[PDB]
Design an enzyme around this catalytic site. Structure first.
Site, PDB file in Angstrom:
ATOM      1  N   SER A 101       9.011   0.978   9.008  1.00 47.88           N
ATOM      2  CA  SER A 101       9.300   1.945  10.070  1.00 47.88           C
ATOM      3  C   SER A 101      10.308   3.003   9.615  1.00 47.88           C
ATOM      4  O   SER A 101      10.256   4.159  10.057  1.00 47.88           O
ATOM      5  CB  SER A 101       9.812   1.243  11.325  1.00 47.88           C
ATOM      6  OG  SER A 101      10.754   0.244  11.001  1.00 47.88           O
ATOM      7  N   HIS A 137       9.075   0.696  15.327  1.00 39.82           N
ATOM      8  CA  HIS A 137       9.608  -0.529  14.763  1.00 39.82           C
ATOM      9  C   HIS A 137       8.590  -1.148  13.821  1.00 39.82           C
ATOM     10  O   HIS A 137       7.387  -0.879  13.897  1.00 39.82           O
ATOM     11  CB  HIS A 137       9.970  -1.549  15.855  1.00 39.82           C
ATOM     12  CG  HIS A 137       8.777  -2.252  16.435  1.00 39.82           C
ATOM     13  ND1 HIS A 137       8.278  -3.429  15.915  1.00 39.82           N
ATOM     14  CD2 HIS A 137       7.969  -1.934  17.478  1.00 39.82           C
ATOM     15  CE1 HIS A 137       7.231  -3.818  16.624  1.00 39.82           C
ATOM     16  NE2 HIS A 137       7.017  -2.926  17.575  1.00 39.82           N
ATOM     17  N   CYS A 138       9.089  -2.014  12.947  1.00 41.85           N
ATOM     18  CA  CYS A 138       8.213  -2.891  12.195  1.00 41.85           C
ATOM     19  C   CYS A 138       8.786  -4.293  12.344  1.00 41.85           C
ATOM     20  O   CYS A 138       9.105  -4.702  13.467  1.00 41.85           O
ATOM     21  CB  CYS A 138       8.079  -2.437  10.740  1.00 41.85           C
ATOM     22  SG  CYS A 138       9.642  -2.153   9.863  1.00 41.85           S
ATOM     23  N   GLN A 139       8.926  -5.044  11.257  1.00 45.01           N
ATOM     24  CA  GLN A 139       9.535  -6.362  11.420  1.00 45.01           C
ATOM     25  C   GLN A 139      11.058  -6.268  11.451  1.00 45.01           C
ATOM     26  O   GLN A 139      11.692  -6.667  12.436  1.00 45.01           O
ATOM     27  CB  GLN A 139       9.078  -7.313  10.318  1.00 45.01           C
ATOM     28  CG  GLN A 139       9.419  -8.770  10.625  1.00 45.01           C
ATOM     29  CD  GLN A 139       8.282  -9.722  10.311  1.00 45.01           C
ATOM     30  OE1 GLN A 139       7.681  -9.651   9.238  1.00 45.01           O
ATOM     31  NE2 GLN A 139       7.987 -10.629  11.242  1.00 45.01           N
TER      32      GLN A 139
END
Length: 147
Positions: free
Chosen positions: A96, A88-90
């Site tokens: 991601s 995940h990222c934001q």
């Protein structure tokens, strides 16, 4: 957007998915890749998951290629002990998503176009930054040339 299963052991999500402990356990996720320098490693204190931070910034001119091999090794680590991995990222839209697309190109042998289409079909919101798109295109070249 909900957490996106990519492969039986690989899930692409946003910072909210990383906080969803109930979903993570139900999906047998034992591993977490956080593709930001600044987000927390949610649930770290609970001692349940193995974490990897790839400290990407918020600038689109940054180099993500340098993190590909590190991420790939971690995904194979999860797969080899029979657990799932959440990356995940934001928002799960650009940072991601790029790593997931890169993984499918190298370890699933998809072309960039099919890899993009594969993830886009499952996660319609993905839209990697154009600088990230160019790095994936150079990665595709490197894969085709055997580099």
């Amino acid at each position: 957007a909900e957490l996106t299963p990519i492969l039986p052991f690989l899930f692409l999500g946003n910072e909210q998915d990383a906080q969803d402990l109930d979903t993570m356990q139900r999906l047998n996720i034992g591993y977490v890749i956080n593709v930001t320098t600044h987000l927390p490693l949610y649930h770290y204190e609970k001692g349940l998951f193995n974490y990897k931070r790839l400290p990407a910034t918020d600038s689109n001119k940054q180099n993500l290629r340098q993190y590909f091999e590190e991420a790939f090794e971690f995904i194979e680590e999860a797969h080899q002990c029979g657990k799932g991995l959440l990356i995940h990222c934001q928002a799960g839209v650009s940072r991601s998503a790029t790593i997931v697309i890169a993984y499918l190109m190298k370890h699933t042998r998809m072309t960039m176009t099919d890899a993009y289409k594969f993830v886009k079909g499952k996660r319609p919101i993905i839209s990697p930054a154009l600088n990230f798109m160019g790095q994936l295109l150079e990665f595709e070249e490197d894969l085709n040339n055997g580099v």
